[PDB]
Design a protein. Structure first.
Lengths: 126, 127
């Protein structure tokens, strides 16, 4: 029986730029040979994430990891993501009680989401 | 916040094939339209996973989601995966006290891992 999530691993080109992304946006906590595949582990809210050198290097897709946030800090988060100059999907016009998410990319084509409110998939607003 | 993981959403060609992958292998529990993109949610050991029908494929990389299993279940899961017929990166020879992982794909070029033992990334073993 599956006992829990063990980790997620992502391949990026540049571990320092991805480190900056994970620390600035998610307050990722970094835990820790001449390798060509250098790597790093972080914890973000109970999740172990490995970043390892490789190729950014795919296509963009709608696959994504969503992290939960409070509704009250959606605007703050949006401003930090905007500070990294990464690609964001502009938030659309919204009605009251419509739960908010932010969709945006890292430097290697991965799509992330910060999700507040009721669990659901919101990509179809874009 | 970051309170925790909200969910992971995977895009797949055929929701029925993927349902069988997730259910036969991970014992995923299905949760709760006329869209030409429907969706399902499943729960796997507390992770909320959504799958959503889309495009056709995506090339293969080493980005992967790894779930935790126990060392005494590795061979059994290995069987459950081969029985489904999915592509699997076969276990290499191994020494005593090294933990085992199984790396295998779904039907849509997503890499998954069942990881027993000590946390580390094990991709280098397949080089
Ligand atoms: Mn989502
Ligand atoms: Mn791994």
């Amino acid at each position: 029986m599956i006992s829990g999530l063990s980790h997620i691993t992502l391949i990026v080109k540049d571990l320092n730029k991805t480190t900056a992304f994970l620390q600035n946006i998610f307050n990722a906590e970094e835990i820790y040979t001449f390798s060509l595949s250098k790597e790093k582990f972080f914890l973000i809210a109970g999740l172990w994430i490995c970043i390892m050198e490789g190729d950014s290097l795919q296509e963009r897709t709608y696959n994504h990891i969503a992290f939960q946030i409070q509704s009250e800090e959606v605007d703050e988060y949006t401003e930090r993501i905007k500070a990294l100059g990464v690609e964001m999907k502009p938030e659309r016009p919204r009605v009251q009680g419509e739960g908010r998410s932010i969709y945006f990319y890292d430097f290697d084509n991965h799509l992330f989401e910060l999700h507040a409110g009721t669990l659901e998939e919101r990509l179809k607003r874009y």
